Coordinates of C-alpha atoms in Angstrom, one line a residue:
Chain A
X1 CA 9.7 2.3 48.7
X2 CA 9.5 3.7 45.3
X3 CA 10.6 0.1 44.0
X4 CA 7.9 -1.3 46.5
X5 CA 5.2 1.2 44.9
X6 CA 6.3 0.0 41.2
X7 CA 6.0 -3.7 42.3
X8 CA 2.6 -3.1 43.9
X9 CA 1.3 -1.2 40.8
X10 CA 2.5 -3.8 38.5
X11 CA 0.4 -6.5 40.5
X12 CA -2.4 -4.3 40.7
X13 CA -2.4 -3.7 36.9
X14 CA -1.9 -7.5 36.6
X15 CA -4.8 -8.1 38.7
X16 CA -7.1 -6.0 36.9
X17 CA -6.0 -7.4 33.4
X18 CA -6.2 -11.1 34.3
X19 CA -9.6 -10.7 36.1
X20 CA -10.9 -8.8 32.9
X21 CA -9.6 -11.7 30.5
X22 CA -11.1 -14.3 32.7
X23 CA -14.6 -12.4 32.9
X24 CA -14.9 -12.4 29.3
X25 CA -14.1 -16.2 28.9
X26 CA -10.3 -16.1 28.3
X27 CA -8.8 -19.5 28.7
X28 CA -6.4 -20.2 31.9
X29 CA -3.4 -20.2 29.1
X30 CA -4.6 -16.6 27.7
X31 CA -4.9 -15.4 31.3
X32 CA -1.3 -16.8 32.1
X33 CA -0.1 -15.1 28.8
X34 CA -1.4 -11.7 30.0
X35 CA 0.0 -12.1 33.5
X36 CA 3.5 -12.7 32.0
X37 CA 3.5 -9.3 30.3
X38 CA 5.5 -7.8 33.2
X39 CA 7.3 -4.7 31.5
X40 CA 3.8 -3.8 29.6
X41 CA 2.1 -4.1 33.1
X42 CA 4.7 -2.0 34.8
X43 CA 5.2 0.7 32.2
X44 CA 1.8 2.4 33.0
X45 CA 3.3 3.1 36.5
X46 CA 6.2 5.0 34.8
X47 CA 3.7 7.1 32.5
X48 CA 1.7 8.0 35.5
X49 CA 4.7 9.3 37.7
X50 CA 3.6 13.1 37.5
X51 CA 0.1 12.2 38.9
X52 CA -0.2 13.8 42.4
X53 CA -3.6 12.0 43.5
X54 CA -2.9 8.2 44.2
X55 CA -6.4 7.3 43.5
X56 CA -6.3 8.7 40.2
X57 CA -2.8 7.3 39.5
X58 CA -3.8 3.8 40.4
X59 CA -7.0 4.1 38.2
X60 CA -5.3 5.7 35.2
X61 CA -2.3 3.1 35.4
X62 CA -4.7 0.0 35.3
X63 CA -6.6 1.5 32.4
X64 CA -3.3 2.1 30.4
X65 CA -2.4 -1.5 31.2
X66 CA -5.8 -2.7 29.7
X67 CA -5.2 -1.0 26.2
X68 CA -1.2 -2.0 26.0
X69 CA -2.2 -5.5 26.8
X70 CA -5.0 -5.5 24.1
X71 CA -2.7 -4.2 21.5
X72 CA -0.1 -6.7 22.6
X73 CA -2.8 -9.4 22.1
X74 CA -3.7 -7.8 18.5
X75 CA 0.2 -8.3 17.7
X76 CA 0.1 -11.9 18.8
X77 CA -3.0 -12.3 16.6
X78 CA -1.1 -10.8 13.5
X79 CA 2.0 -13.0 14.1
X80 CA -0.3 -16.1 14.9
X81 CA 2.6 -18.0 16.6
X82 CA 1.7 -18.0 20.5
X83 CA -0.2 -21.3 20.0
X84 CA -3.2 -19.4 21.9
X85 CA -6.7 -19.6 20.5
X86 CA -7.3 -17.0 17.7
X87 CA -10.8 -16.5 18.7
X88 CA -10.1 -15.8 22.3
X89 CA -7.1 -13.5 21.3
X90 CA -9.6 -11.4 19.1
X91 CA -12.5 -11.3 21.6
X92 CA -10.2 -10.6 24.6
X93 CA -8.3 -8.0 22.5
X94 CA -11.4 -6.1 21.9
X95 CA -12.9 -6.6 25.2
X96 CA -9.8 -5.2 27.2
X97 CA -9.6 -2.3 24.6
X98 CA -13.2 -1.2 25.0
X99 CA -13.1 -1.4 29.0
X100 CA -9.7 0.8 28.5
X101 CA -11.6 3.4 26.5
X102 CA -14.4 3.6 29.1
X103 CA -12.1 4.1 32.1
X104 CA -9.7 6.6 30.4
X105 CA -12.8 8.6 29.2
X106 CA -13.9 8.5 33.0
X107 CA -10.6 10.2 34.0
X108 CA -9.9 12.7 31.2
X109 CA -10.3 16.3 31.7
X110 CA -12.0 16.7 28.3
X111 CA -14.4 14.2 26.7
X112 CA -12.7 14.1 23.2
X113 CA -9.2 13.9 24.6
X114 CA -8.8 10.0 24.4
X115 CA -10.2 9.7 20.8
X116 CA -8.3 12.8 19.7
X117 CA -4.9 11.3 20.9
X118 CA -5.9 7.8 19.4
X119 CA -6.9 9.2 16.2
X120 CA -4.0 12.0 15.7
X121 CA -1.2 9.5 14.5
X122 CA -3.3 6.3 14.0
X123 CA -2.1 6.4 10.3
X124 CA 1.7 6.9 11.4
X125 CA 1.2 4.1 13.8
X126 CA -0.9 1.7 11.7
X127 CA 0.9 2.3 8.4
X128 CA 4.1 2.3 10.2
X129 CA 3.8 -1.4 11.4
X130 CA 2.6 -2.4 7.8
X131 CA 5.9 -0.8 6.3
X132 CA 8.2 -2.3 9.1
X133 CA 6.8 -5.9 8.1
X134 CA 6.8 -4.9 4.2
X135 CA 10.4 -3.6 4.0
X136 CA 12.8 -5.2 6.5
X137 CA 15.5 -2.7 7.7
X138 CA 18.9 -3.2 6.3
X139 CA 20.8 -0.5 8.5
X140 CA 20.5 1.5 11.7
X141 CA 18.5 4.5 10.0
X142 CA 15.9 2.1 8.5
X143 CA 15.8 0.4 12.0
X144 CA 15.2 3.6 13.8
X145 CA 12.6 5.0 11.4
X146 CA 10.6 1.7 11.6
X147 CA 11.2 1.6 15.6
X148 CA 9.8 5.4 15.8
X149 CA 6.5 3.9 14.8
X150 CA 5.5 0.7 16.6
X151 CA 7.8 1.6 19.6
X152 CA 8.0 5.3 20.3
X153 CA 4.7 6.3 18.6
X154 CA 3.2 3.5 20.2
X155 CA 4.2 4.4 23.8
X156 CA 3.9 8.2 23.3
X157 CA 0.2 7.9 22.8
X158 CA 0.0 6.3 26.2
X159 CA 2.2 9.0 27.5
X160 CA -0.3 11.8 26.1
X161 CA -3.2 9.6 27.6
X162 CA -1.4 9.6 31.1
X163 CA -1.2 13.3 30.8
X164 CA -4.8 13.8 29.6
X165 CA -6.4 11.4 32.3
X166 CA -3.6 12.4 35.1
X167 CA -5.4 15.7 36.2
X168 CA -3.3 18.7 37.2
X169 CA 0.6 19.3 37.2
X170 CA 1.3 16.9 33.9
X171 CA 3.7 18.6 31.5
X172 CA 1.9 16.7 28.6
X173 CA 4.9 17.2 25.9
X174 CA 7.3 15.8 28.4
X175 CA 5.5 12.8 29.6
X176 CA 5.2 11.9 26.0
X177 CA 8.9 12.7 25.1
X178 CA 9.9 10.3 28.1
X179 CA 7.5 7.6 26.7
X180 CA 8.9 7.9 23.1
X181 CA 12.5 7.8 24.1
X182 CA 12.1 5.0 26.8
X183 CA 10.0 2.9 24.3
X184 CA 12.8 3.0 21.8
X185 CA 15.4 1.9 24.7
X186 CA 12.9 -1.1 25.4
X187 CA 12.5 -1.9 21.6
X188 CA 16.3 -2.1 21.1
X189 CA 16.4 -4.4 24.4
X190 CA 13.5 -6.7 22.9
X191 CA 15.2 -6.9 19.7
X192 CA 18.8 -7.9 21.0
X193 CA 16.9 -10.5 23.3
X194 CA 14.3 -11.9 20.8
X195 CA 17.0 -12.7 18.3
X196 CA 17.6 -15.9 20.7
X197 CA 14.2 -16.2 22.7
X198 CA 12.1 -16.0 19.4
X199 CA 14.6 -16.8 16.6
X200 CA 14.0 -13.5 14.9
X201 CA 16.3 -12.3 11.8
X202 CA 14.8 -10.2 9.2
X203 CA 14.7 -6.5 10.3
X204 CA 16.2 -7.4 13.6
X205 CA 18.9 -5.0 15.2
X206 CA 21.0 -7.9 16.7
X207 CA 21.1 -9.9 13.1
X208 CA 22.0 -6.6 11.5
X209 CA 24.7 -6.0 14.1
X210 CA 26.1 -9.7 13.6
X211 CA 25.8 -9.3 10.0
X212 CA 28.1 -6.2 9.8
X213 CA 25.2 -3.8 8.6
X214 CA 25.2 -2.0 11.9
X215 CA 28.2 -0.9 14.0
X216 CA 28.3 -1.2 17.9
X217 CA 29.3 2.3 18.3
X218 CA 26.3 3.6 16.5
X219 CA 24.0 1.5 18.8
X220 CA 25.8 2.9 21.8
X221 CA 25.3 6.5 20.5
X222 CA 21.7 5.8 20.0
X223 CA 21.1 4.3 23.5
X224 CA 23.0 7.3 24.9
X225 CA 20.9 9.9 22.9
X226 CA 17.7 8.0 24.3
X227 CA 19.1 8.0 27.7
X228 CA 19.6 12.0 27.7
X229 CA 16.1 12.4 25.9
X230 CA 14.4 10.4 28.7
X231 CA 16.5 12.2 31.5
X232 CA 15.5 15.7 29.9
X233 CA 11.8 14.8 29.8
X234 CA 11.7 13.8 33.5
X235 CA 13.7 17.0 34.6
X236 CA 11.1 19.3 33.1
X237 CA 9.1 21.0 35.9
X238 CA 7.3 19.8 37.9
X239 CA 9.7 16.9 37.3
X240 CA 9.5 13.1 37.7
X241 CA 13.0 12.6 39.6
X242 CA 11.8 9.0 40.6
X243 CA 12.0 8.0 36.8
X244 CA 15.9 8.8 36.6
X245 CA 17.1 5.4 38.1
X246 CA 14.4 3.7 35.8
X247 CA 16.1 5.4 32.8
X248 CA 19.6 4.3 33.7
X249 CA 18.7 0.8 34.7
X250 CA 17.1 0.1 31.1
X251 CA 19.9 1.9 29.3
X252 CA 22.7 0.3 31.3
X253 CA 21.1 -3.1 31.0
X254 CA 21.4 -2.9 27.2
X255 CA 24.9 -1.5 27.2
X256 CA 26.4 -4.1 29.7
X257 CA 24.2 -7.2 29.4
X258 CA 22.8 -7.5 25.7
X259 CA 25.1 -5.6 23.4
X260 CA 28.3 -7.9 24.2
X261 CA 26.1 -10.9 23.1
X262 CA 26.1 -9.5 19.5
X263 CA 29.7 -7.7 19.3
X264 CA 32.4 -10.0 20.6
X265 CA 35.9 -9.7 22.3
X266 CA 36.6 -6.1 20.9
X267 CA 33.3 -4.7 21.7
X268 CA 32.1 -1.4 20.3
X269 CA 34.4 1.4 19.1
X270 CA 38.1 1.8 18.4
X271 CA 40.7 -0.3 20.3
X272 CA 41.9 2.2 23.0
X273 CA 45.7 3.4 23.0
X274 CA 48.4 4.9 25.3
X275 CA 50.3 7.8 23.9
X276 CA 53.9 8.7 25.4
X277 CA 57.4 9.7 24.3
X278 CA 60.3 7.1 24.6
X279 CA 63.9 7.5 23.4
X280 CA 62.8 10.7 21.8
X281 CA 60.1 9.2 19.4
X282 CA 56.3 9.6 19.2
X283 CA 54.6 6.2 20.5
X284 CA 51.2 4.9 20.7
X285 CA 50.5 1.3 21.8
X286 CA 47.2 -0.7 21.6
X287 CA 45.6 -1.7 25.2
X288 CA 45.7 -5.3 23.4
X289 CA 49.7 -5.2 23.2
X290 CA 50.2 -4.1 27.2
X291 CA 51.5 -6.9 29.5
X292 CA 52.5 -5.6 33.0
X293 CA 51.2 -2.2 34.5
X294 CA 52.0 -0.7 38.0
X295 CA 51.9 2.8 39.8
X296 CA 54.8 4.8 41.0
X297 CA 53.1 8.1 42.8
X298 CA 51.1 9.5 39.8
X299 CA 53.1 7.8 37.2
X300 CA 51.8 4.6 35.4
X301 CA 54.6 2.3 34.4
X302 CA 54.1 -0.7 32.0
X303 CA 55.6 -3.1 29.4
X304 CA 54.2 -4.3 25.8
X305 CA 54.6 -6.6 22.9
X306 CA 56.9 -4.6 20.4
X307 CA 56.9 -7.5 17.7
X308 CA 58.5 -10.9 18.1
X309 CA 60.3 -11.7 21.3
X310 CA 60.8 -7.9 21.9
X311 CA 59.4 -6.2 25.1
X312 CA 59.0 -2.6 25.1
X313 CA 58.8 0.0 28.1
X314 CA 56.9 3.1 28.9
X315 CA 55.4 5.3 31.7
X316 CA 52.8 8.0 31.5
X317 CA 51.0 10.4 34.0
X318 CA 47.8 8.9 35.4
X319 CA 46.2 12.0 33.7
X320 CA 47.2 10.8 30.3
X321 CA 46.4 7.1 30.9
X322 CA 43.2 5.8 29.3
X323 CA 40.6 4.2 31.6
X324 CA 41.6 0.8 30.0
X325 CA 45.0 1.0 31.4
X326 CA 44.1 2.1 34.8
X327 CA 41.7 -0.7 34.9
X328 CA 44.6 -3.2 34.1
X329 CA 46.4 -1.3 37.2
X330 CA 43.3 -2.3 39.5
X331 CA 43.3 -5.9 38.0
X332 CA 47.3 -6.6 38.6
Chain B
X1 CA -35.3 11.0 -5.8
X2 CA -37.0 7.9 -3.8
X3 CA -35.7 5.9 -0.8
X4 CA -33.8 3.2 -2.9
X5 CA -32.0 6.2 -4.5
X6 CA -30.8 7.5 -1.1
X7 CA -29.7 4.0 0.0
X8 CA -27.8 3.6 -3.1
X9 CA -26.2 6.9 -2.5
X10 CA -25.4 6.2 1.1
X11 CA -23.8 2.6 0.5
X12 CA -21.5 4.1 -2.3
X13 CA -20.5 7.0 0.0
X14 CA -19.9 4.7 2.8
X15 CA -17.8 2.3 0.5
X16 CA -15.8 5.4 -0.5
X17 CA -15.1 6.6 2.8
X18 CA -13.8 2.9 3.8
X19 CA -11.7 2.4 0.9
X20 CA -10.1 5.9 1.1
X21 CA -9.2 5.2 4.6
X22 CA -8.0 1.6 3.9
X23 CA -5.6 2.8 1.1
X24 CA -4.3 5.8 3.0
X25 CA -3.1 3.6 6.0
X26 CA -1.2 1.3 3.7
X27 CA -4.0 -1.1 2.7
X28 CA -2.9 -3.3 -0.4
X29 CA -5.3 -3.5 -3.4
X30 CA -6.6 -7.0 -2.3
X31 CA -7.4 -5.5 1.1
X32 CA -9.1 -2.4 -0.3
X33 CA -11.0 -4.8 -2.8
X34 CA -12.0 -7.0 0.1
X35 CA -13.5 -4.0 2.2
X36 CA -15.4 -2.7 -0.9
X37 CA -17.2 -6.2 -1.3
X38 CA -18.8 -6.0 2.3
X39 CA -22.0 -4.7 0.6
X40 CA -24.5 -5.4 3.4
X41 CA -22.0 -4.2 6.0
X42 CA -21.6 -1.0 4.1
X43 CA -25.4 -0.6 3.5
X44 CA -26.8 -1.3 7.0
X45 CA -25.7 2.0 8.6
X46 CA -28.2 3.7 6.0
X47 CA -31.1 1.4 7.7
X48 CA -29.6 2.4 11.2
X49 CA -29.8 6.0 10.6
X50 CA -33.3 6.4 9.0
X51 CA -34.6 8.3 12.1
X52 CA -31.9 11.2 11.5
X53 CA -33.8 14.2 10.1
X54 CA -30.7 16.4 9.1
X55 CA -29.3 14.8 5.9
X56 CA -25.8 16.1 6.6
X57 CA -25.7 14.4 10.2
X58 CA -27.2 11.3 8.6
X59 CA -24.5 11.0 6.1
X60 CA -21.9 11.5 8.9
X61 CA -23.1 8.8 11.3
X62 CA -23.9 6.4 8.5
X63 CA -20.1 6.6 7.2
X64 CA -18.6 6.5 10.8
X65 CA -20.8 3.4 11.8
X66 CA -19.5 1.6 8.3
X67 CA -15.9 2.2 9.5
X68 CA -16.1 0.5 12.6
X69 CA -18.5 -2.3 11.3
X70 CA -15.8 -2.9 8.6
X71 CA -13.2 -2.7 11.3
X72 CA -15.1 -5.6 13.3
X73 CA -15.5 -7.6 10.1
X74 CA -11.8 -7.4 9.6
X75 CA -11.0 -8.5 13.3
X76 CA -13.4 -11.6 12.2
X77 CA -11.3 -12.3 9.2
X78 CA -8.1 -12.2 11.4
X79 CA -9.7 -14.8 13.9
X80 CA -10.8 -17.1 11.1
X81 CA -7.3 -16.8 9.1
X82 CA -9.1 -18.0 6.0
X83 CA -9.2 -15.0 3.5
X84 CA -5.6 -15.5 2.3
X85 CA -5.1 -11.7 3.0
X86 CA -1.8 -10.3 4.9
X87 CA -2.5 -10.6 8.8
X88 CA -0.3 -7.6 9.4
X89 CA -2.4 -5.3 7.0
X90 CA -5.6 -7.0 8.5
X91 CA -4.8 -5.9 12.0
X92 CA -3.3 -2.7 11.2
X93 CA -6.4 -1.5 9.0
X94 CA -8.6 -3.1 11.5
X95 CA -7.1 -0.7 14.3
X96 CA -7.0 2.3 12.0
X97 CA -10.7 2.2 10.8
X98 CA -11.8 1.6 14.4
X99 CA -9.9 4.5 15.8
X100 CA -11.4 6.8 13.0
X101 CA -14.8 5.5 13.7
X102 CA -14.5 6.4 17.6
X103 CA -13.3 9.9 16.5
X104 CA -16.0 10.5 14.0
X105 CA -18.6 9.1 16.3
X106 CA -17.4 11.1 19.4
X107 CA -17.5 14.4 17.1
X108 CA -21.3 13.7 16.4
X109 CA -22.4 12.4 19.9
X110 CA -24.5 14.8 22.2
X111 CA -22.3 13.4 24.9
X112 CA -18.9 12.1 23.5
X113 CA -18.9 9.7 26.8
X114 CA -22.2 7.9 25.3
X115 CA -19.8 6.0 22.7
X116 CA -17.7 4.4 25.2
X117 CA -20.6 3.7 27.4
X118 CA -22.5 1.9 24.6
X119 CA -19.4 0.0 23.4
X120 CA -18.4 -1.1 27.2
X121 CA -21.9 -1.8 28.4
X122 CA -22.4 -5.3 26.9
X123 CA -18.8 -5.7 25.6
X124 CA -18.5 -9.0 27.7
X125 CA -21.9 -10.4 26.3
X126 CA -20.5 -9.7 22.8
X127 CA -17.0 -10.8 23.3
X128 CA -17.8 -13.7 25.6
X129 CA -20.7 -14.7 23.2
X130 CA -18.3 -14.9 20.1
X131 CA -15.9 -17.2 22.2
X132 CA -18.9 -19.5 23.3
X133 CA -20.4 -19.7 19.6
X134 CA -17.1 -20.7 18.0
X135 CA -16.4 -23.3 21.1
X136 CA -19.6 -25.5 21.4
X137 CA -21.7 -25.5 17.9
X138 CA -25.6 -25.4 17.9
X139 CA -27.6 -28.7 17.3
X140 CA -31.0 -27.3 17.3
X141 CA -32.8 -23.7 16.5
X142 CA -32.6 -22.8 20.2
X143 CA -29.0 -23.1 20.5
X144 CA -28.4 -21.4 17.0
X145 CA -30.7 -18.5 18.0
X146 CA -29.0 -18.1 21.4
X147 CA -25.5 -17.8 19.6
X148 CA -27.0 -15.6 16.8
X149 CA -28.3 -13.1 19.6
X150 CA -24.7 -12.1 20.4
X151 CA -22.5 -12.2 17.2
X152 CA -25.7 -10.9 15.1
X153 CA -28.2 -9.2 17.5
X154 CA -25.9 -7.7 20.2
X155 CA -23.3 -6.8 17.4
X156 CA -25.8 -4.6 15.4
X157 CA -27.9 -3.4 18.5
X158 CA -24.7 -1.5 19.7
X159 CA -24.5 0.5 16.3
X160 CA -28.3 1.0 16.6
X161 CA -27.6 2.7 20.1
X162 CA -24.8 4.6 18.6
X163 CA -26.9 5.8 15.7
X164 CA -29.5 7.2 18.2
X165 CA -26.6 8.8 20.4
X166 CA -25.1 10.4 17.3
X167 CA -28.4 11.3 15.7
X168 CA -30.4 14.5 16.2
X169 CA -32.2 13.5 19.5
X170 CA -35.9 12.7 20.1
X171 CA -34.7 9.6 18.3
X172 CA -36.4 6.5 20.0
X173 CA -32.9 4.9 21.1
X174 CA -34.7 1.6 22.5
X175 CA -36.7 1.3 19.3
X176 CA -33.6 1.9 17.1
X177 CA -31.7 -0.9 18.8
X178 CA -34.8 -3.3 18.8
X179 CA -35.0 -2.6 15.0
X180 CA -31.1 -3.5 14.9
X181 CA -31.2 -6.7 17.0
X182 CA -34.4 -8.0 15.1
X183 CA -33.1 -7.0 11.6
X184 CA -29.7 -8.4 12.4
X185 CA -30.9 -11.9 13.3
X186 CA -32.9 -12.0 10.0
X187 CA -29.8 -11.0 8.0
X188 CA -27.5 -13.6 10.2
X189 CA -29.9 -16.5 9.2
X190 CA -29.6 -15.1 5.5
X191 CA -25.8 -15.1 5.7
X192 CA -25.9 -18.7 7.2
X193 CA -28.2 -20.1 4.5
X194 CA -25.9 -18.4 1.8
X195 CA -22.5 -19.2 3.3
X196 CA -23.2 -22.9 3.5
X197 CA -22.3 -23.1 -0.3
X198 CA -21.0 -19.6 -1.7
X199 CA -24.6 -23.5 11.0
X200 CA -28.4 -23.3 10.4
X201 CA -28.1 -24.8 6.8
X202 CA -26.4 -27.9 7.8
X203 CA -28.9 -28.3 10.7
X204 CA -31.9 -28.0 8.2
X205 CA -30.3 -30.4 5.7
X206 CA -29.8 -33.2 8.4
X207 CA -33.4 -32.4 9.8
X208 CA -32.1 -31.3 13.3
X209 CA -34.1 -28.1 12.6
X210 CA -37.7 -28.2 10.9
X211 CA -38.4 -25.7 8.0
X212 CA -41.6 -24.6 9.7
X213 CA -39.7 -23.5 12.7
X214 CA -37.2 -21.3 10.6
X215 CA -40.4 -19.7 8.8
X216 CA -41.9 -18.9 12.4
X217 CA -38.6 -17.5 13.7
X218 CA -38.4 -15.2 10.5
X219 CA -42.1 -14.2 10.9
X220 CA -41.4 -13.3 14.5
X221 CA -38.4 -11.1 13.7
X222 CA -40.4 -9.5 10.9
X223 CA -43.0 -8.4 13.4
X224 CA -40.4 -7.3 16.0
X225 CA -38.6 -5.0 13.4
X226 CA -42.0 -3.6 12.2
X227 CA -43.2 -2.9 15.7
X228 CA -39.7 -1.2 16.6
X229 CA -40.0 1.3 13.6
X230 CA -43.8 2.2 14.3
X231 CA -42.7 3.4 17.8
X232 CA -42.8 7.3 17.7
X233 CA -41.4 9.4 16.0
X234 CA -41.4 6.5 13.5
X235 CA -39.3 5.2 10.5
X236 CA -41.9 4.3 8.0
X237 CA -39.1 4.0 5.3
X238 CA -37.6 0.7 7.1
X239 CA -41.1 -1.1 6.7
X240 CA -40.3 -2.3 3.0
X241 CA -36.7 -3.0 4.0
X242 CA -37.8 -5.5 6.7
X243 CA -40.2 -7.2 4.1
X244 CA -37.5 -7.4 1.5
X245 CA -34.8 -9.2 3.6
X246 CA -37.4 -11.3 5.4
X247 CA -39.1 -12.4 2.2
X248 CA -35.6 -12.9 0.4
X249 CA -35.0 -15.7 3.2
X250 CA -38.4 -17.2 2.8
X251 CA -38.6 -17.3 -0.9
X252 CA -35.0 -17.7 -2.3
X253 CA -33.0 -19.1 0.7
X254 CA -35.1 -21.7 2.6
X255 CA -35.8 -23.8 -0.4
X256 CA -32.1 -24.4 -1.2
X257 CA -32.1 -26.3 2.3
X258 CA -35.3 -28.3 2.4

């Protein structure tokens, strides 16, 4: 029923946003574009997870959706590649944003809190986007520095706004920490998808991986860092434990589904090995050279390509077998 | 130190506040230059804040209005895509200037909530209005005025209402806005009759609009503005401003099209 709350909230955000686009003279196409922004429409549900009163939660959630969609329309306006009418994009962008300020300011504890949060790192956000497009990233460090502005800072602001508007029991710092880590996991996902969905190359993480400029294991480490940052934020009292499966779902999806499209047979990291003694020598074979593998009690016995026709023999304790050997066990 | 001296100092102060803000958020020299060239846009906040008795509050509201007015002009450049400027800079500077304005306006407002009230109230009339304008173009003076009452009158009306909300109170808010809506349409006509060359001009030239009707509208807007600035407390300094912009359209611009 948490998965059902998250679907209903997306649908309620989609309803609020499309009505507002249509009420301002948005074309059916532009309405269909905003209704299509599924994760943008759902993300506000994540940011409001700490909100105890469900009437305030639903109201903060739709107001965040308005402004996130507005900024997405501004972005479509600066790319100017949607085929949507530019006048509609501009005027609907403005209208949604002004409705969002009104609604957020109606819910905030403090009258200045909304404009304080939007102003505080405006230069970092707006100058960040300019430099992202001005100087294309050529390695992971550059990719992350850019992504921390239009991804992390972008969504952190909506985290702070969710805390400011979300009444009592909101660990402001932690809502924002969650938002910033989660946004970077999503931003990596979008780069690794939009390589092919959108034909994107310059500054694109997938292009940097395929090119050799960025190593798969560095990408895996960043994803694991972002997973751990988001998990820590959601464990801070009074806690948002409902967000734990969400964090795993998005990180795992990048690891399992998207990364492999830009790496290849080997994958990320060094080729796994089996260490054993055999006729008195120290021996170490690549999981790639291993042929047959079978269990006898807690021993794993196996054969390998030793060079030429030559077949080698070994056995190790299951305690000293890498996961990759035990996997071939299960698959033989 | 007369009134044209106060205006000149206000216009320079608004320009400097805008250019510093564009430069510091990563605006290129072409975008900084573009922003500094928006003379009337940087000037008009001075007129809007004529009812503000504290000179320091007046300087602060004037420059805040200038940030947002320039912001909305940059959004307008972004929807036309005809300046040859970088769309990423346009968008990012548009956003930054606007967010600074919200911050500076809310810090001056009696009630910070009044800023987002004023901006939301007729947001649909303004934004729906601009879509309808750029869709189905005017073929007579009635249609032209209908369209210009959104992107001109409602546009500047909002900044009128914001000036009164961020001013020193007693300020006659309805009259500030009435001044702004009437004056806005005078300068929108002026812009239309300049921006043909450098659309009301096309209609005057192909005789779909009679000169005498344009004169009558200008005289009506002149009277509306003079009435607004005679409501108490009163902004007598705006009388010569109304005459200057009106007479300029009658004397300099109309003859170019008749």
